[PDB]
Design a protein around this motif. Structure first.
Motif, short mmCIF file in Angstrom:
data_model
loop_
_atom_site.label_atom_id
_atom_site.label_comp_id
_atom_site.label_asym_id
_atom_site.label_seq_id
_atom_site.Cartn_x
_atom_site.Cartn_y
_atom_site.Cartn_z
N UNK A 1 1.52 -37.31 -8.34
CA UNK A 1 2.51 -37.71 -7.34
C UNK A 1 2.25 -39.13 -6.87
N UNK B 1 14.57 -39.02 -8.83
CA UNK B 1 14.89 -38.96 -7.41
C UNK B 1 15.04 -40.35 -6.82
N UNK C 1 1.57 -24.85 4.85
CA UNK C 1 1.96 -25.34 3.54
C UNK C 1 2.00 -24.21 2.52
N UNK D 1 11.02 -35.75 1.46
CA UNK D 1 11.42 -34.36 1.16
C UNK D 1 10.45 -33.61 0.26
N UNK D 2 9.41 -34.25 -0.26
CA UNK D 2 8.53 -33.59 -1.20
C UNK D 2 7.48 -32.71 -0.52
N UNK D 3 7.22 -32.94 0.76
CA UNK D 3 6.21 -32.23 1.54
C UNK D 3 4.83 -32.48 0.95
N UNK D 4 4.53 -33.74 0.67
CA UNK D 4 3.18 -34.17 0.33
C UNK D 4 2.31 -34.23 1.58
N UNK D 5 1.01 -33.96 1.40
CA UNK D 5 0.10 -33.94 2.55
C UNK D 5 -0.05 -35.33 3.14
N UNK E 1 11.01 -24.62 2.37
CA UNK E 1 11.27 -26.03 2.64
C UNK E 1 11.94 -26.14 4.01
N UNK E 2 11.65 -27.18 4.78
CA UNK E 2 12.31 -27.34 6.09
C UNK E 2 13.81 -27.25 6.02
N UNK F 1 6.08 -24.50 0.61
CA UNK F 1 7.17 -25.28 1.21
C UNK F 1 7.91 -26.23 0.26
N UNK F 2 7.25 -26.83 -0.71
CA UNK F 2 7.94 -27.86 -1.46
C UNK F 2 7.25 -28.33 -2.71
N UNK F 3 7.86 -29.30 -3.40
CA UNK F 3 7.24 -29.78 -4.64
C UNK F 3 5.82 -30.26 -4.42
N UNK F 4 5.57 -30.92 -3.28
CA UNK F 4 4.25 -31.42 -2.94
C UNK F 4 3.25 -30.37 -2.53
#
Lengths: 188, 188
Positions: free
Chosen positions: B161, B27, A144, B183-187, A125-126, A155-158
């Motif tokens: 999501x 969240x 990713x 913060x989720x890092x979704x595309x 994660x960043x 990187x993250x939940x997404x």
């Protein structure tokens, strides 16, 4: 002939980063063991979802070896993983037998704590980059999903779906991953 | 001044479609109650993840009303939701007070069983389309997320999501959803 995955579940883990890989891996026919770091008791995840593990880590350790060890994220979950001597032993053994190690979001910072895979390209994660890069022991990537040798990070939940399908592809190959992917209604 | 969400959790539910909205909604500062259809006991989801609910549906019913009622998918979970008289009562009451109803994947077929929102545009998992459309009481959409009036539907685990963030946007507005999303890092 069945592949086997160990998911290590600690208090404070990100519950989305735990359930997505477990679910997707079981859709791929992988035998997954969700092992509680602290025992068999239910685990309170970072957003208060409570998950019952399949086994204690102590018992799951004896039923190795696993084709992949999976480290979910969550800041506090990852800190618990980093402080555990049992996790150190599992990861070192997995590195020695050249098994796959997969960690997502803050999960990779446990690799640094346990001196695992130094020299590899990794992502986090960043918000966890600075912690992972303390000492310059890894090379950082902003992909990713990143796979370098036997170290697979994300990187993250997404990115959890891409992360889980990368595990499936590494274990069961590209055709199984594509078959499992289609009913999920993923965008890309 | 806190918005409230009811997530109804039945045996056979898709655990990814349960945990993602619960997590994302918390969240966003929403007070979420994960209520077990059959009681307070742990629920075995479709891919054998076991989740401990926050309450029985019976107890959660008394602490209404909720700004959203959320119906996860999973074929067998959705069948249990469709057969439950308690779910019928909750959904009818929610429709009457013009509260939001959200269902994903196979979850929307419970709306048909309980005669909820007839005339609305809805989406489902492609494999659940025929069941949802029995009688022509709805108009079908292939959008990943569909919102018509107070009925919000979505297609599958991979749309979870987008589904969850649509709930947040409907309850808390677009800026909160964007803040929670980053913060989720979704595309996309």
């Amino acid at each position: 002939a069945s592949k086997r995955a160990l998911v290590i579940l600690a208090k404070g883990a990100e519950e989305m980063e735990t359930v997505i890989p477990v679910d997707v891996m079981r859709r791929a026919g992988i035998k997954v063991t969700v092992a509680g770091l602290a025992g068999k008791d239910p685990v309170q995840c970072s957003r208060d979802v409570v998950i019952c593990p399949d086994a204690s880590l102590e018992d799951a350790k004896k039923e190795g070896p696993y084709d992949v060890v999976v480290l979910p994220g969550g800041n506090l979950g990852a800190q618990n993983l980093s402080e555990s001597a049992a996790v150190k032993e599992i990861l070192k053994e997995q590195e020695n037998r050249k098994g796959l190690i997969a960690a997502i979001c803050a999960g990779p910072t446990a690799l640094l704590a346990h001196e695992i895979g130094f020299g590899s390209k990794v992502t986090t994660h960043p918000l966890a980059k600075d912690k992972m890069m303390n000492g310059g022991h890894y090379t950082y990537s902003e992909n990713r999903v990143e796979k370098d040798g036997l170290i697979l990070t994300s990187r993250g939940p997404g990115t959890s779906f891409e992360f889980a399908l990368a595990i499936v592809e590494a274990l069961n190959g590209k055709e199984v991953a594509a078959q499992v992917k289609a009913p999920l209604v993923l965008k890309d």
